[PDB]
Each structure stands twice: as structure tokens, then as C-alpha cells.
Design a protein around this ligand. Structure first.
Ligand SMILES: O=c1c(O)c(-c2ccc(O)c(O)c2)oc2cc(O)cc(O)c12
Length: 274
């Protein structure tokens, strides 16, 4: 096999990897690296080219094409450089030190105000609007796949993990009903996932997970979500409406990202302004 991207010798001449492993999946690992010249931190994602007996370089190229298309959108993580060796394609990615928005959805962490959730969702919607305007549907917008540039203080959103992206069977609890019914790919699926993200940020509970997958699937297909006074006692009606407008069975009835940006819940004046 003939290599396309810059050589590994170059990678090691230009970067040093740190002891901080950032993430690992079955066919990928992400590690922090540092430019030897500048000292700037990046995230190096090593994607295996062979998976499950299938040559996946074409798919990796598609993922690079997407990150490149969205370079001008600061809500999508930016690709800095690319290297390649025998088994791997290595993405040198903008570093986001704040971790996953998932971290903010756990009981443990409380430090996330309505102001913060409103801004994060708005930034998420800006990134998705941009993607959709370009006929890109992420298709994997779990809270794990949106990072923050900082948490001390709370920074800005960076959508990552475009491996499932497409033009207009993963982790069960975040699959949209249309995916469970083998309907085609719609931009509406991302909007369902933004419903789940708002629900998780605000309740710190997962909206559809059951005691097992079969129940998880029953909850998604029936759109059986907990809106009891107990779970929603500290959640605002406006936030409730936003969520309830996204989490509906029929994808055609979900508002677009554009319309979501005009939702009353997100209209705020910064009090510092005249
Ligand atoms: O974990 C990370 C991750 O997966 C990705 C990523 C981005 C785009 C892709 O298309 C992709 O496959 C992966 O970027 C990152 C950037 C960071 O600064 C820190 C990270 O931890 C990740």
C-alpha cells in the first residue's frame, strides 16, 4: 500500500506525544501531543485503516473531507494536520481541554446554571445549523461527542467524531426512532439528539435508558420520557417545551436547527449591554 499523508518520521520530528491518553475505541486511540517548535497542544487521533476485515481508508478520507469543509465553523473541531503510517491515519486536531459535555450531565457535577445550558445548546445549534446547511448530518451527536474548549471557566463547544456523518446499530439509548425503523437519513435525527442533550444537561438523567436494551428500544419507539414534576422541579417550562418539541416520534414534526435558534427559551439579553 502507497501512503498519502505526511510521513511518520515527520510526525516524530515535529511532535512529541504526552502520557495523557485522551480516548480509545476498538479501532482508534486519541493522545495529546505537543509541537516541538511552538509548544502548542493538540489531540492526535490514530485511526486504524483496516477494520473488521474491511479497508477503511476511503471512509477516513470522507471524515477528513468533512472536517475540512467545516474549518470556518468554530463549533466544529478544526483539523490542523494529517499523517499516515502503515496501519494508521493520524489526525492532528485542535485541543479542547474541557472534556465532554457528558461530564456536565452526571449527578456528581452542581456548577451548571441555566445561563450555561442555554449558551451551550445555542452553540450546539449553531454548529448543527452550519452542518445541515452543508447537507452534512452528524448522526452520532451523543453528549460524549461534543467537547468543551475549557471548564475553568466554562468555554465553547466543539463537535467531534464525524465517523458516522453522511449526506441527507450504535449505542442504543441515543438512536433516533427513525434509525430503529430503518427510515432514511434525515437532518431531523441530529435534532432528536439535541433534545436528548438538553434533557441530560438539565435533569442529569438519561431520557431513554432502561434496565436492558429491549426496554431502551421500547422507550425510544414509544417516546416514553419522564417529564414528572419530580425530575422537572428545577427545570423551566421554556426548557421543557424546547425538549418536548425535539423529542417526538415523527421526524417531520421536529423543528430545524434554524427554528430552534429562535426558540423563546434561547432568547436572552446579556445584562452588561446598553
Ligand atoms: O477525543 C477526541 C476525538 O475523538 C476527536 C475527533 C474529532 C473529529 C473526528 O472526526 C474524530 O474522529 C475524532 O477530537 C478530539 C479533539 C480534542 O482536542 C480532544 C479529544 O479528546 C478529541
Amino acid at each position: 500500500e502507497n501512503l498519502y499523508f505526511q510521513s511518520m518520521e515527520n510526525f516524530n520530528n515535529f511532535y512529541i506525544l504526552t502520557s495523557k491518553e485522551l480516548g480509545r475505541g476498538k479501532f482508534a486511540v486519541v493522545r495529546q501531543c505537543i509541537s516541538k517548535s511552538t509548544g502548542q497542544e493538540y489531540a492526535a487521533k490514530f485511526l486504524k485503516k483496516r477494520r473488521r476485515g474491511q479497508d477503511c481508508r476511503a471512509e477516513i478520507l470522507h471524515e477528513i473531507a468533512v472536517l475540512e469543509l467545516a474549518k470556518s465553523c468554530p463549533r466544529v473541531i478544526n483539523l490542523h494536520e494529517v499523517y499516515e503510517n502503515t496501519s494508521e491515519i493520524i489526525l492532528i486536531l485542535e485541543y479542547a481541554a474541557g472534556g465532554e459535555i457528558f461530564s456536565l450531565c452526571l449527578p456528581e457535577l452542581e456548577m451548571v446554571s441555566e445561563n450555561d445550558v442555554i449558551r451551550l445548546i445555542k452553540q450546539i445549534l449553531e454548529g448543527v445549523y452550519y452542518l445541515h446547511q452543508n447537507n452534512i448530518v452528524h448522526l452520532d451527536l451523543k453528549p460524549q461527542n461534543i467537547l468543551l474548549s475549557s471548564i475553568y471557566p466554562l468555554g465553547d463547544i466543539k463537535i467531534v467524531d464525524f465517523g458516522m456523518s453522511r449526506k441527507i446499530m450504535g449505542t442504543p439509548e441515543y438512536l433516533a426512532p427513525e434509525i430503529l425503523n430503518y427510515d432514511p437519513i434525515t437532518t431531523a435525527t441530529d435534532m432528536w439528539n439535541i433534545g436528548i442533550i438538553a434533557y441530560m444537561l438539565l435533569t442529569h438523567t438519561s431520557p431513554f435508558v432502561g434496565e436492558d436494551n429491549q426496554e431502551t428500544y421500547l422507550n425510544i419507539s414509544q417516546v416514553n420520557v419522564d417529564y414528572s414534576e419530580e425530575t422537572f422541579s428545577s427545570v423551566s417550562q421554556l426548557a421543557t417545551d424546547f425538549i418536548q418539541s425535539l423529542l417526538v416520534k415523527n421526524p417531520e414534526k421536529r423543528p430545524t436547527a434554524e427554528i430552534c435558534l429562535s426558540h423563546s427559551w434561547l432568547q436572552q439579553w446579556d445584562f452588561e449591554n446598553l
